[PDB]
From a paper:
Originally discovered in the circulation of pregnant women as a protein secreted by placental trophoblasts, the metalloprotease [name] ([name]) is also widely expressed by many other tissues. It cleaves insulin-like growth factor-binding proteins (IGFBPs) to increase the bioavailability of IGFs and plays essential roles in multiple growth-promoting processes. While the vast majority of the circulatory [name] in pregnancy is proteolytically inactive due to covalent inhibition by proform of eosinophil major basic protein ([name]), the activity of [name] can also be covalently inhibited by another less characterized modulator, [name] ([name]). Here we present two cryo-EM structures of endogenous purified [name] in complex with either [name] or [name]. Both modulators form 2:2 heterotetramer with [name] and establish extensive interactions with multiple domains of [name] that are distal to the catalytic cleft.
Next, we recombinantly overexpressed [name] in suspended HEK293F cells to biochemically study the enzymatic properties of [name]. The conserved core catalytic Glu483 residue was mutated to Alanine (E483A) to avoid auto-cleavage and serve as the loss-of-function control. After the proteins were purified to homogeneity, cryo-EM was applied and a final 3.8 Å-resolution half-density map was obtained using a similar strategy as for [name]·[name]. The map revealed an extra component in the structure, which was then identified to be the co-purified endogenous [name]. Unlike the two [name] subunits that locate separately in the [name]·[name] complex, [name] exits as a homodimer and also forms 2:2 heterotetramer with [name]. Each [name] contains nine α-helices and 14 cysteines, 12 of which form six pairs of intramolecular disulfide bonds and Cys211 residues from the two [name] molecules form an intermolecular one to facilitate the dimerization. Besides, Cys120 links to Cys652 of [name] and locates at the [name]–[name] interface. In contrast, the PD from [name]·[name] complex is only attached to the SD without interacting with any other domains. As a result, the relative orientation of the LGD, PD, and SD remains unchanged in the two complexes, forming a rigid core of [name]; but the βBD, CCP, and CTD have drastic translational and rotational differences and thus constitute a movable region. In contrast, the dimeric [name] efficiently induced the formation of a 2:2 heterotetramer with the C1130S variant of [name] (lane 5). However, the [name]-contaminated [name] only accounted for a small amount, and the majority appeared as apo [name] dimer that is too dynamic for the high-resolution structure determination.
Author numbering:
A (entry chain B): 900 to 1111
B (entry chain A): 1062 to 1111, 1134 to 1223
C (entry chain G), D (entry chain C): 42 to 212
E (entry chain A): 1494 to 1536
F (entry chain B): 90 to 364, 378 to 384, 389 to 791
The structure:
Amino acid sequence: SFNCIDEPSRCYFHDGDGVCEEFEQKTSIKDCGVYTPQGFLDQWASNASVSHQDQQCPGWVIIGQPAASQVCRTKVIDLSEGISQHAWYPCTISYPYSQLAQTTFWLRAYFSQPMVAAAVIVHLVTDGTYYGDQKQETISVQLLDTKDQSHDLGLHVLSCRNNPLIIPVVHDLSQPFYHSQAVRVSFSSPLVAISGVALRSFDNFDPVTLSS
Amino acid sequence: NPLIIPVVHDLSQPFYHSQAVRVSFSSPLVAISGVALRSFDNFDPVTLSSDCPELAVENASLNCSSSDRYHGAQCTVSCRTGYVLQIRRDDELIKSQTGPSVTVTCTEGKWNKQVACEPVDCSIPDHHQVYAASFSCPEG
Amino acid sequence: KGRLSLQNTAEIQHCLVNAGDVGCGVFECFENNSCEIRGLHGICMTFLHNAGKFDAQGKSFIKDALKCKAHALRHRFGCISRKCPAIREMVSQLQRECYLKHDLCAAAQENTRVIVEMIHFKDLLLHEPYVDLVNLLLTCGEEVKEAITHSVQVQCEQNWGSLCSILSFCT
Amino acid sequence: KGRLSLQNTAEIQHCLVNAGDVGCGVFECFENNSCEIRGLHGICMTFLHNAGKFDAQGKSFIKDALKCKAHALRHRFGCISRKCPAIREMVSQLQRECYLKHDLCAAAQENTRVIVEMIHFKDLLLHEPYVDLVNLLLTCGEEVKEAITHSVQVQCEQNWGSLCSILSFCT
Amino acid sequence: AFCNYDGGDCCTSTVKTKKVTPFPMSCDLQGDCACRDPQAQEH
Amino acid sequence: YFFSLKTDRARQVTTINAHRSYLPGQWVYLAATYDGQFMKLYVNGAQVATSGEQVGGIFSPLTQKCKVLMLGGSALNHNYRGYIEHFSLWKVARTQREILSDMETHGAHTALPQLLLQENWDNVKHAWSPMKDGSSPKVEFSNAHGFLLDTSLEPPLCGQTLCDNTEVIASYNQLSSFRQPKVVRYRVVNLYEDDHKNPTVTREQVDFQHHQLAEAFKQYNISWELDVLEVSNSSLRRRLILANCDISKIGDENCDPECNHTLTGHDGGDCRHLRDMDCNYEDGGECCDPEITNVTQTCFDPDSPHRAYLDVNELKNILKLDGSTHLNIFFAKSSEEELAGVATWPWDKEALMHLGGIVLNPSFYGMPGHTHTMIHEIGHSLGLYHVFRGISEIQSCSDPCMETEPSFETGDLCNDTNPAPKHKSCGDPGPGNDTCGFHSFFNTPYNNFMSYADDDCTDSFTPNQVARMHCYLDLVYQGWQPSRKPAPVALAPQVLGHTTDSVTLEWFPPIDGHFFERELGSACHLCLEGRILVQYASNASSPMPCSPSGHWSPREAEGHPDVEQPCKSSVRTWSPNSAVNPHTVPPACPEPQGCYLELEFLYPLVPESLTIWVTFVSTDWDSSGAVNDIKLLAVSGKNISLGPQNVFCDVPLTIRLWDVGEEVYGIQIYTLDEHLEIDAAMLTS
Ligand SMILES: [Zn+2]
């Protein structure tokens, strides 16, 4: 985990550096973004709409590939920093009102190119673990499509090691395919902050245009 | 009388050519008249997996020379000093980390992105700048 | 849990009218019900398990008592209010009037050692017909009462040491 | 279930050395163990729940008894054989030598009405330290024994009618 | 204040265990058995 | 190492870390740069981490006189322990080339306007002032450029010794001068009664096994000199000796196949399906006293003075042989018996001690059907792993190394050894889902001795496994071979510099690490380059916690530190709560002094440094230091006291000793922690 870039060969450490290289794409997933497999293609959300939109945290931060330079938050107590410029957490509802009222927040992100869903990538800057509250929180990754309701995928817990959490789309081949259009992410804890959602598809074939 | 078993397959796993079906049971009274296998009559997925208007952005520098705004008019948009870039995408497939600038491309008579060079937002002065003083910003 | 509606009365009624009144089939049907009247089937099985220790008079008493209890359970279960205290009252009343009319005291004075040494401390406390049989049996003879209190003290020394150490002597 | 190993002897030891000997924190830590020695925390809670009914002598006795019990429990839990009979032996021995040296019989003689009506059936039948306290208070005073056995009889009429109906009179 | 606030046992700043454990479990911590000493660190 | 920054304009303090735990005995040229956009940290000349969040100057010029610069600590007493050699602060940001130039020129630097401060400690009071309540640190003599060639080679991610390095094992492969014929002396321990009539292994078994051993190694330049040692003791001979049977599971009710015998009571009745010959399941001394019946018949008490089962380590403790001049072979009957006893690796602390050797089965030693299973136990004693170590002995598929490809630093660490699973049948095994990363194996080394195959299909060693055999006989086993040829230089000399007329070259020390002539009956095998004696703990003692005057003898806290994971709790360390019986609650250590470990050193010397490998600490502590106190003993009885030190899980504690004018023959480590795990100690003279 070093690289030397001179004729007298001065060297530097490239894992914690903020610049991605050509060789670093297959090795450091934490600096060059999510590593797409060779048989698939990732597409990130566009025209993402949120629920508790405010002046402090707007809803256009989900657009595009997020910065992977943001480290995981271990038992984060406060979110008064400049985290909303590169992420999104609910700001209208604070800690005690969310803890007592037990409300719900959602992120209804749209997409641009209608393709099938092979996996759903959700990249978060934190696991939502509180300094006092040690109880784990579980989020739900729904999925929306054109001219139909949904195709549910289940629920998942947050892991710091898997910050770009991947949801395998469960689908039976006896059922006909569907063109995924939007992704809805719902969570009830206020400390869940989403940096960006994605959608994995096939760059080889599209199974909707043929099975008309 | 025919029992249909939906085949579960995760789309992250690549497809495979199913060749044989094993049916195993312990009750002696099971009588089977025939077993089938459902496939796609259309495709084999193993061999497959073997004029835009002029755009103006405030507080920026449109240093691009797309003289003809046809399908493929590549332009570059960069904000000025003290201004950060906001992107609201419309139609796109892949993204690239351009940096402080961005590339906006023409597609079907509309631009693929909506960029906006919003000014940077300084914090409201409460503490940490002047000790024991009152701050009254008249502008913003 | 105060009503016998949790378990359907139709299936237990079909079980009662399908089985015979000679064996413990009626007590096999009645033992699974909503109200906790469990224990009659255990009495029917244990009385027919230690029947060889009794004499001819005792075995005739066992046959007559089980026949009267089965005929009464098939008889007076027709019109009765569906609640657990009423079911407990009618079960205790049929058991009392069946055991009093067939000379339980005569069978006690025949052979009391079998009738006081084959009882079990486990499931005696939680079964009401067992408590009914115990508190009806000791009013026959004073020696039978002394033997069953000796058995209770032996079972205290076996299972629960609380009442042995506390008030072993009354006054 | 004969070993205390199933509950880590490290976490309960950490809980013992982390808490203080004034309150019921040691008995709060001690209740979750592999052997069934539950009941000391109930004694500590019930003694510190109805402290207003006791006088100054009774309150001083309660404070000194809980202080000595907490100090002895934190002291002699260091080196002991890991088996449930040894745990019962050391708990009962510390309870006996703590109650005897602080004049439990004097607190029985001063205010008996609070100390004999505080026992609850089904909370002493399955708890060994409650049984130890009950028999020590019974041996402390004759009228205390009479009052606590009257409470035992009222609770037998409340809960379990077996030993009331069986050997109400001893001889 | 007549009995010197029970030697400071009702106030957290004057107890070696840094906790308050009143004699009745029924007394509320902000009522009769509360730290009402102004000389403590509560004020 | 970390470098934190928070300017007056900014709102968030940001830290920059390093990429590795710091070395507690190496000179590090730490360099922190900040230009205005990116702050960078250089550890020993390489850029480790750079952050670009801080912008602007660090303070306004109006508050210039208010900022202060502190060295070695802060106002909240965040004190530093170590040496500071050449302080330097610049008024401008220097790039990496200037950092390396200031490294290579040391402190002999001229005056520059960018050069704010360049302090070499010849007059501290001219530019620095101590605290008015504190005292100035002491000035000593040290050299940062002490070595211009690093003589330390790091072992790989799943290696253990010096010869597991990539460039040292290859020198024993290409060259042929390192594979000369070598004679290794070894012994066979034969137990007899007091009448010289019954052996543990017959003489014809030893005669057949010696020729079969020399036949399989004569093609690899290895010869074995056999010296059979016979010990006559009827107390040891008549009783059962077991090797794989642990002593803790005998008292535990959990069953285990290693302890299941009629002379063990079938794990004390804890393995039989039924749960005097049958009423002895754990008669309270009635069946163990010799006046009633024989002790070896029906006694299985784990705390009896005389019992039927005997562990091999207690047999080695009773015998107390010499392992520095011979290889000891012992015998033990075991219920498992699929393999022999657990051999001692050369990188263990028991490589040359009396507790080390090869434990075999006496009913298979010398038999023609199981002759080769000693040879495999030779290969475990000579530094060779199993061939399936990179596949079968993999606890998790996210391991640091897993032999999916042949390499010199993965799995078996041999290129000729193909990856293979755990197989018993000869030839290439069938496919399965047991392997985590492969399905089809071709050219599996079934012919190698390291597989679990039978006697017929094991014939020869791969030529990449003879380099390790000829390496470990020079590294660890130099005292075994009677040849006076010293250990050779295992690495080629490196060219340091040159000019138009001369070229300067340096080479490594020889591979065994000895810097002096190997003279027996002296301390010359522990001296270092520069007349420095470095020694470990020879004798260790600690009081029993459940006894008033027990004073049990710990064993795992003596030798060199051997822990695979330096923060996970292990079994090769000394613990206060490990001294108790498994059926006894461990007591808490006393308050004002705590439980202590008394270590004793073999050679009493005037100490210069003391290093203690504290392995595992509890997550929370009452005092700030886990080790409460350290008392240096003396030959004159003056206990020199030292206060608490803050230990870390990974980095060993290191203490520099000033003004100790008396020789120290041992130390005492007083701690209050229940689960503190001391592994080793070292007294650098
Ligand atoms: Zn092996």
